[PDB]
Design a binder for this molecule. Structure first.
Ligand SMILES: [Zn+2]
Lengths: 52, 94, 141, 136, 340
RNA sequence: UGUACAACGGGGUAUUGUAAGCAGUAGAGUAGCCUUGUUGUUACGAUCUGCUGAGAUUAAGCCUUUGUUGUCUGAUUUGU
RNA sequence: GAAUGUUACCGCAAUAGUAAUUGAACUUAGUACGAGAGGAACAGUUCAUUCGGAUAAUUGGUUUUUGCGGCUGUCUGAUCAGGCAUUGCCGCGAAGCUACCAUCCGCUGGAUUAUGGCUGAACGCCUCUAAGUCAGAAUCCAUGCUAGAACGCGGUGAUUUC
RNA sequence: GUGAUUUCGAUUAACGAGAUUCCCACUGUCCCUAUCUA
RNA sequence: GUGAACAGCCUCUAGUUGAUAGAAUAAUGUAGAUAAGGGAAGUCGGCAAAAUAGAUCCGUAACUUCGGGAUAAGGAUUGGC
């Protein structure tokens, strides 16, 4: 059987990873960043409520 | 198999089995059918004229409520007297 | 998923819970817990075991036949999916369970009528039969 | 899953080690099936090979017909007393242990199977499915 | 016998297991935390409606064990810059937020009740008129640091734990330039970061924790209480604390939270955000656990498939629980003696 | 000197399987009485039934707490 | 575990160890190839074997929870409530422990070997080799994982009133 | 000197802390361990 | 008292409360137990454990020196009132 370190299956994994998997990763990270910005804005709005 | 090949190919294509559903409305084809609610199976309660049967049930319920289906002294002595007797009994048992 | 009911005590069986025994005549007994399963293996009678719904309904601790109780059965004829029908079912299930709770409380109260009378009779017998301890009670008070 | 099975087989709790006698659940004329080996059994030192529902074993006939005795033949396990977990969510078990005689290609030697057949065994062996009257 | 890579079998130096590798950074991406802190709060069971083409269980439902990790938002209280040297990474500067809660100030004491609680009182004097010293140190980090990590601490007072001392850790910031990382940290000083701004559902994460201790076992010696890093645990649900119906799915309409009847055993109820992770993770209930992002871009269809949960088991774990809610229990049993 | 801690108590959650006492016109029958029956009568009587999913236990490594009572301190050592 | 002012928190990483394995199934396909009989593989998917590290939601086992109930003999006048029978015996039994008897998880870059080459002399032909250079094995070194030098190192907090 | 007795050097019931091969039953001997008490 | 019983178990009269103590409860050891499915596959070797066990009724083979074998084997039953 092909090993975990098998070069052919490693090349196949690399070419697969370069595509749809990485696209999913990038979209996920963008959404996570957007909701992190939303979280910061929410806390800053609570601080603004305190000031007001 | 042509649609499968165009989309993903065999082993990665994910066919939507709700697309060939024959319903009164097409927008209902992509809907989640609930099955659990408070320890009951929804499919068990799923049947036509459920509204008519529930109307009959509520009518019988109103009749029972009208008839009074949902609702401290003894001979010789009053409420305080029976309370004193019960208090003495509890004291004796203790 | 399907919520089953225990063959022995009739308690609900949820996914993964309990154990199933398939007999050679190919009928499946689902047990909610090893207590019920072991009682079944010992061949005890649920209708005799007081903590089972079989015994309770047999002996009259609770109602076995009721208009609310007739609503739920295993449907062997499927119905076409209809969103309005599903929403009406979701409403009616809560309404029916509420009505069944009211009827269950009424049935229990009807079962337990007379308890106050028996308690008063026993208290009267005890107080009358013990006049000498009332003297000590009054000495304290 | 050896030769004749249909697709992949998941792990099921082992119930029948080598040297076990199970019932024979077909009308081939055998009364029991004595396990001498289990096909597709991974090797570990000082471990008895064992079989589960849906497995193919090699068995002799301890009790049955004189023609069917004396010969090692393939059999397929269709019932086990040992409880196993079904992936949809149930732990279940049968009353006894039972298997059916078969050829190397998985075809049933007999004509029908008596008693419930394990769903896993039926879905793995199409001939068992064809000859089953009760599937769980 | 045994895997020789897990030698020596000695006790972990700390109860909080160390993260020894963060994901490789990509500067073009936005600023994100690589890791999060939580407390292990028991396990339960779910029914998943599986969509996995090729499988014998495609379009069929399976029952899975899951772990629940109680994750109230972490508080950002500091930043540390690292410079690479011919001898490895070296920390050059630590900058702290102006105010720190008693929850984190307890971490700096062995005997809190007896102390004058002077910790960081002289540090707070740097935010006096211009913040010039704080700004100079942040400028130093921006100029020389090649790796920036943020100091965060857990809000252990939001948990059912008897411990009042918060756990403090470094979390690597990935994405953006060094100056953008430092700006993000400075903006988030004394602010909370929620678990859903770090992770999301269907994502594969890694669990780093110290395992269950077993004392002396028969060569003989210490068994358990080792640092372990388990990888590729799928997130089945990121729940919200302020959300009723935490345990309700689209298929199960019962309005109920994630907390089982009677509470988790040896751990209270879940009243915060939580992570439902498929399978088991190292550690036992109440242990502090570190959740890390995947080190590599996973090439599995398992990392891609969406999770559709049908039902979450909220029956009692304190016995052979049969009822999901107390209302269901009452509706089954009926009217008891003390109800009248 | 606190959304402090503890001991009790309260509520959940579980385990078992229906407590003690009393009552019955339920109980193989036997004896006693006599208003010789067509639910005549009395004593004993394994067991049965109702009060009664009752009663008991439930953290000791379960969860929770607008209650009650209390506690909040001794000793040693460490300096560029 | 003493000592490197004290004490506390967060880190670095020299060095040492190191782990994954094999089979099958779908599709490619009844295709390439073949008078026929027969009949592959790469890319894309899904499982299992052996081994390892965990874990206790569920199922199973276990009970001094002597938790609840039951039984024999004797003893406390009887009832109640209990004692003794070296865990008296029996049924169930939470919690804990635990099982291939249960569940989960176990990767990806450089440099190479054999070999196949490019340019190219030696040797006015030629030549994969001499200078140079491209690919390439489950190999090597890294990545990752475990420990962390108690005489390796860094950052940071607080540092005694008589 | 032989060692009951009978029958035809062989044979022999009853008995044995004597020796050997199997059978049923049984099982933690084992697959494969796990738990409880002192 | 139970019981066939000077057995074992509990009690009355009489006697004793002696054995270095305290705190913890990891592995291991010794003694005593339980266990899914399988059932000798373990081992030189069923070693050790398990299973059997009292009494009443029925029933009992080969062989035999006619005395035995024999509690052969194999079934049913056992409380309280
Ligand atoms: Zn039960």
């Amino acid at each position: 059987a092909k090993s975990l370190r098998a070069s052919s299956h490693l090349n196949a994994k690399s070419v697969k990873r370069r595509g749809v998997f990485q696209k999913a990763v990038d979209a996920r990270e963008q959404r996570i960043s957007d909701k992190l910005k939303e979280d910061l804005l929410k806390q800053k709005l609570e601080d603004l409520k305190k000031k007001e | 198999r042509d649609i499968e090949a165009e989309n993903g190919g065999a082993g990665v294509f994910n066919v939507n089995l709700k697309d060939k559903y024959l319903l009164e409305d097409d927008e209902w084809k992509n809907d989640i059918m609930p099955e659990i609610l408070d320890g009951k199976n929804v499919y068990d309660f799923l049947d036509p004229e459920i509204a008519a049967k529930l109307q009959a049930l509520e009518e019988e319920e109103e009749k029972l409520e009208n008839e009074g289906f949902y609702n401290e002294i003894y001979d010789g002595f009053e409420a305080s007297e029976v309370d004193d007797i019960k208090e003495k009994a509890a004291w004796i048992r203790n | 998923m399907r919520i089953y009911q225990c063959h022995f005590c009739s308690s609900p069986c949820y996914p993964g819970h309990g154990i199933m025994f398939v007999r050679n005549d190919a009928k499946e007994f689902r047990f909610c817990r090893s207590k019920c399963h072991k009682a079944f293996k010992q061949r005890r009678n649920p209708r005799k075991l007081k903590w089972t719904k079989a015994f309770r309904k047999a002996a009259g601790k609770e109602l076995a036949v009721d208009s609310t109780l007739t609503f739920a059965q295993r449907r062997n004829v499927p119905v076409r999916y209809n969103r309005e029908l599903v929403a009406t079912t979701l409403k009616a299930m809560a309404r029916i369970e509420e009505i069944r709770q009211k009827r269950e409380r009424a049935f229990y109260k009807n079962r337990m009528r007379g308890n106050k009378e028996k308690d008063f009779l026993r208290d009267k017998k005890l107080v009358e039969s013990n006049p000498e301890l009332l003297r000590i009670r009054e000495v304290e008070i | 899953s050896g030769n004749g099975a249909q697709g992949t087989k998941f792990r099921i709790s082992l119930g029948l080690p080598v040297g076990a006698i199970m019932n024979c659940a077909d009308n081939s004329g055998a009364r029991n099936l004595y396990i001498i080996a289990v096909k597709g059994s991974g090797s570990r030192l000082n471990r008895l090979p064992a079989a589960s529902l849906g497995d193919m074993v090699m068995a002799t006939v301890k009790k049955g017909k004189p023609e069917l005795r004396k010969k090692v033949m393939p059999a397929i396990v269709v019932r086990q007393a040992k409880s196993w977990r079904r992936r949809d969510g149930v732990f279940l078990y049968f009353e006894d242990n039972a298997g059916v005689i078969a050829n190397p290609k998985g075809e049933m030697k007999g004509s029908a199977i008596t008693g419930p057949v394990g769903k896993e065994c039926a879905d793995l062996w199409p001939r068992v499915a064809s000859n089953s009257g009760v599937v769980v | 016998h045994g895997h020789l890579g897990f030698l020596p079998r000695k006790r972990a130096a700390s109860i909080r297991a160390r993260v020894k590798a963060f994901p490789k950074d990509d500067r073009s991406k936005p600023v994100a935390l690589t890791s999060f802190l939580g407390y292990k709060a028991g396990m339960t069971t779910i029914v998943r409606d599986l969509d996995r083409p090729g499988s014998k269980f495609h379009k069929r439902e399976v029952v899975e064990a899951v772990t629940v990790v109680d994750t109230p938002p972490v508080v950002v209280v500091g930043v540390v810059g690292y410079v690479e040297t011919p001898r490895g990474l070296r920390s050059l500067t630590t900058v702290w937020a102006e105010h720190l809660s008693d929850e984190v100030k307890r971490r700096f004491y062995k005997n809190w009740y007896k102390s004058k609680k002077k910790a960081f009182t002289k540090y707070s004097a740097k935010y006096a008129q211009d913040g010039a010293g704080i700004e100079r140190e942040l400028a130093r980090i921006k100029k020389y640091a090649s790796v920036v990590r943020v100091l965060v601490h857990t809000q252990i007072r939001k948990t059912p734990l008897a411990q009042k001392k918060a756990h403090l850790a470094e979390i690597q910031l990935n994405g953006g330039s060094i100056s953008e990382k430092v700006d993000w940290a400075r903006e988030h000083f004394e602010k909370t970061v929620a678990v859903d701004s770090v992770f999301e559902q269907n994502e594969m994460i890694d669990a780093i924790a110290v395992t269950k201790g077993h004392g002396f076992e028969g060569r003989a010696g210490q068994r358990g209480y080792h640092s372990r890093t388990s990888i590729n645990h799928k997130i089945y649900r990121v729940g919200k604390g302020d959300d009723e119906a935490n345990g309700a799915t689209s298929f199960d309409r019962t309005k109920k939270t994630i907390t089982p009847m009677g509470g988790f055993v040896h751990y209270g109820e879940i009243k915060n955000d939580f992570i439902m992770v498929k399978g088991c993770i190292p550690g036992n209930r109440k242990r502090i656990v570190t959740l890390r992002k995947s080190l590599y871009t996973n090439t599995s269809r398992k990392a891609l498939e969406e999770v559709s949960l049908k039902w979450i088991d909220t029956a009692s774990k304190f016995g052979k629980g049969r009822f999901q809610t107390p209302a269901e229990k009452h509706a089954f049993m009926g009217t008891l003696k003390k109800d009248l």
